[PDB]
Amino acid sequence: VRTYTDVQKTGSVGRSIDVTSFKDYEELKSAIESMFGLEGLLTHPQSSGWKLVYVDYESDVLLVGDDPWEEFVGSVRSIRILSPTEVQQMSE
């Protein structure tokens, strides 16, 4: 019985990964980066404009990285990548 959380990106085809395979947030982003060819955009000192979010079991949509790693692994349900444009269809 392991996590196998879905990661999704509009225009690419989804993937399932287990978050416990990684120890901290950075390894989780760097793996997701290399899976969709976004290398350097999720893990950048200068906040690339791409955003990575998740849905927790309370069905809210939250930025990845705020929660301490150990709670997040248990809270996270599905993960999703947001292009600069997408981030802004969602703003108002």
Binding site: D60, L63, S91
Partner: protein, 81 residues
């Protein structure tokens, strides 16, 4: 003694979480949030903060002094005028 709540801005694209125990005054909290949502805010601060107690109701931020606030508040929401 970490104290992490969720913070919703109305109209924000996504939600964030903060550790209340890393701040000391309300004003120290308020400027901390404005910089979380700073990328959303540009394009002063005109929002009003509200928290939600343990009994599930929404109370305005600032009345109860800070130390009791950090133990009372389970979720945050910033409403527009």
């Amino acid at each position: 003694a970490a104290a992490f709540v969720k913070v919703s801005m109305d109209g924000a694209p996504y939600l964030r979480k903060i550790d209340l125990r890393m701040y000391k005054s309300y004003d120290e909290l308020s400027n901390a949030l404005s910089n979380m949502f700073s990328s959303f805010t540009m394009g002063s601060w005109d929002y009003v903060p509200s928290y939600e107690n343990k009994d599930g109701n929404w109370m305005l931020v600032g009345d109860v002094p800070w130390p009791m606030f950090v133990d009372t508040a389970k979720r945050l929401r910033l409403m527009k005028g």
